[PDB]
């Protein structure tokens, strides 16, 4: 823990600075440091943790996709194979990606989820658990894949169950959870009809609850509703 000597408040402040400077590796390291102080995270701090790691893993996934796309082009008679290089480099990125996912999952397990009693926090962390297992699943193969997929499903499902019981249909965390679980169904679990059903149900139930919201909350909820609708359009 290189961040061990730095004040919790300083780690949080520097995470915000890193965010503004679009230095997401730094931001993630600062928030890891903050998590390791052992205290629960506030709403704002939870967002910083998520933004940081989502951006780091997002970069790695994008790179992995480029390389995978190149790798499969070279692996055929149509195009001269380039040697072991593309595979080696794709595997390097894959291993780094797996390292970041493992780090996040480590944090959630030590001990963010355990200590999260409020629905808002618990659902947030369980959604994250599902997400990072989903990212692991994207690059896994065979039997290892199946267990990872089941771990993602179990985290998402537990999050869903709490969110249905404890949160209104327009709650951004509940919506973001449903959006991501829907993507899981479509892209990971090979269940497009479950993905579509979930996205449509989530959208319709949020729509009927919009009347309760102030204009601020309305804007946040409709944003995610729009992503749900965009995905439905793409999938149907």
């Amino acid at each position: 823990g290189a961040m061990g000597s730095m004040e919790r408040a300083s780690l949080i402040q520097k995470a915000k600075l890193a965010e503004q400077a679009e230095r997401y590796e730094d931001m993630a390291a600062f928030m890891k440091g903050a998590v390791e102080k052992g205290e629960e995270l506030s709403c704002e701090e939870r967002n910083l943790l998520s933004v940081a790691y989502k951006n780091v893993v997002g970069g790695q996934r994008a790179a992995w996709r480029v390389l995978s796309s190149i790798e499969q082009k070279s692996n055929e008679e149509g195009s001269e194979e380039k040697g072991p290089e593309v595979r080696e480099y794709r595997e390097k990125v894959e291993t780094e990606l797996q390292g970041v996912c493992d780090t996040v999952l480590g944090l959630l397990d030590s001990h963010l989820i355990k200590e999260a009693g409020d629905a808002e926090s618990r659902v947030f962390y369980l959604k994250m658990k599902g997400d990072y297992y989903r990212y692991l699943a994207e690059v896994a193969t065979g039997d290892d894949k199946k267990r990872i997929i089941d771990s993602a499903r179990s985290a998402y499902q537990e999050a869903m169950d709490i969110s249905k019981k404890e949160m209104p249909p327009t709650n951004p965390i509940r919506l973001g959870l449903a959006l991501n679980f829907s993507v899981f169904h479509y892209e990971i679990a090979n269940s497009p009809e479950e993905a579509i059903s979930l996205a449509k149900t989530t959208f319709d139930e949020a729509m009927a609850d919009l009347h309760t919201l102030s204009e601020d909350s309305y804007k946040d909820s409709t944003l995610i509703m729009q992503l749900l609708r965009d995905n439905l359009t793409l999938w149907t």
Partner: peptide, 18 residues
């Protein structure tokens, strides 16, 4: 909002394409 939606559509479409 538009950029977020555009970004999302690109990521989701990649899966469908590949």
């Amino acid at each position: 909002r538009d950029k977020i939606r555009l970004n999302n559509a690109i990521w989701r479409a990649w899966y469908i394409q590949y």
